Nucleic acid binder design. Structure first.
Length: 437
RNA sequence: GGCCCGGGGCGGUUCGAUUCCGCCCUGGGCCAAC
């Protein structure tokens, strides 16, 4: 029941079984013939090429090497022609530039056009850097592929594995550079417990130093940070997770946690006990990709959250959730209702000019002096958090992200009470309020 | 699309705004996309 014991059992959840490996070998085999029959210059990259793909995530990456001189237009057109001819079923995908996705003998395949270059300089898109990334990795990761899978499964089970915006976690590539550096999953974990928000891991120089931010320098390009999109809080959760695993190893660290759904009745009671204002802003999800949507959701929550704090509603935390249908921005505040009156600081008494202007304003209550300066009693246009956001969101829609903002400008409502407990947000709310059990 | 740094114009709020809330032009850096 010590680390060694647990990892043996974990490998079973991360390493693909013969029937999954075989399924892939057969797709690769068949895909190679289709490509060779056309005399196409390609290279298999990704975790499939390096047998480091996590169980249940089999997907073959085929990058087509195109002459340096070609125009981006050719790469896409000839690439679209090739993927079309070699796949059982195809579908155009769009990244920095479009490529093709499809299936071959039952397995997911990406046919990506890229430039064939020597020396990282002259990379025109991220996809061009990939070949170099693969080259640097194949000779060094060999032999440690299951250590990579253990790390992938760990991060996945704990909701931090992708590097895309919906996760802001540790990309696959980052995982492999980590194993090449520490040597194994256990060593990465042990040392990770010592990581700070200032850590810098330079793989090429086999060094660790103090920087201005968490920075894992790319072996193929010193100016690039592989963990660039690893959020500060996700970094923190990881570090904390390593301390815990080492303090009490468990196979649970590799098993996805159950949704743990709660009955809305119990949620209602908890919000009651808390005495806070819990509400959400609902609008229609713009028809855009997660990579453009989630950052907008993050911006939206933040701007409204900031409106809540300078307006004295004492917000505790915010959250958000997207469905096929709608989007929700969640909030919990300490103040359900504030007075209409509030004090406004005015000029110091010896300032005859401004004092005169400050008193020239007609107010309902008459200003006073306190500690050498004038203060005025003012009245608010709103006295509840919900009342405030309905105002803010109605006039500041344009600052809530291009798309999300435009969607809220055309429609939005603030839900609270029993009506909120009935939305597909009970999970986000429990995580927001720490609801344990 | 989001984040960072910088320019040129405005609106609102305020006794007082480069300084708070925002809107248009605009230069460069970076991130996700395998």
């Amino acid at each position: 029941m010590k680390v060694e014991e647990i990892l043996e059992k974990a490998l079973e959840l991360v390493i693909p079984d013969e029937e999954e490996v075989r399924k892939g070998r057969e797709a690769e085999e068949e895909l190679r013939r289709r490509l060779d029959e056309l005399g196409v210059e390609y290279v298999f990259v990704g975790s499939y090429a390096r047998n480091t793909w996590l169980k249940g995530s089999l997907e073959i990456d085929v990058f087509l090497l195109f002459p340096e001189e070609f125009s981006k237009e050719e790469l896409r057109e000839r690439g679209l022609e090739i993927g079309k001819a070699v796949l059982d079923s195809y579908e155009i995908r769009y990244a920095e530039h479009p490529y093709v996705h499809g299936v071959v003998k039952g397995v997911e395949v990406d046919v990506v056009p890229c430039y064939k270059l020597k020396e990282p300089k002259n990379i025109k898109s991220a996809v061009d850097r990939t070949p170099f990334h693969h080259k640097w990795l194949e000779g060094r990761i060999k032999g440690k592929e299951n250590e990579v899978r253990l790390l992938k499964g760990f991060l996945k089970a704990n909701g931090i594995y992708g590097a895309e915006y919906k996760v802001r976690g540790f990309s696959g590539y980052l995982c492999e550079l980590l194993i090449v550096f520490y040597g194994s999953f256990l060593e990465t974990v042990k040392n990770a417990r010592r990581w700070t928000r200032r850590t810098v891991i330079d793989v090429a120089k086999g060094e660790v130093r103090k920087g201005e931010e968490f920075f894992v320098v790319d072996p193929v390009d010193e100016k690039r940070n592989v963990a660039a999109n690893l959020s500060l809080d996700n970094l923190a959760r990881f570090v904390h997770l390593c301390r815990e695993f080492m303090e009490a190893p468990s196979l649970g660290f590799f098993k996805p946690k159950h949704p743990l759904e709660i009955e809305p009745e119990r949620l209602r009671k908890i919000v009651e006990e808390r005495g806070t204002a819990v509400f959400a802003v609902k609008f229609r999800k713009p028809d855009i990709v997660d990579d453009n949507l989630y950052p907008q959701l993050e911006r939206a929550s933040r701007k409204i959250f900031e409106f809540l704090e300078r307006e004295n509603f004492m917000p505790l935390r915010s959250a958000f959730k997207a469905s096929e249908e709608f989007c929700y921005l969640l909030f919990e505040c300490q103040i359900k209702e504030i007075s209409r009156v509030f004090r406004r600081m005015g000029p110091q008494f010896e300032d005859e000019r401004n004092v005169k202007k400050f008193l020239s304003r007609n107010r309902a209550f008459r200003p006073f002096i306190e500690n050498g300066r004038w203060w005025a009693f003012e009245m608010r246009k709103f006295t509840t958090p919900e009342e405030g956001v309905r105002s803010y969101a109605s006039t500041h829609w344009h600052t809530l992200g291009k798309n999300v903002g435009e969607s809220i400008r055309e429609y939005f409502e603030i839900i609270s009470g029993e009506k909120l407990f009935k939305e597909p947000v009970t999970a986000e709310l429990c995580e927001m309020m720490g609801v344990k059990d």
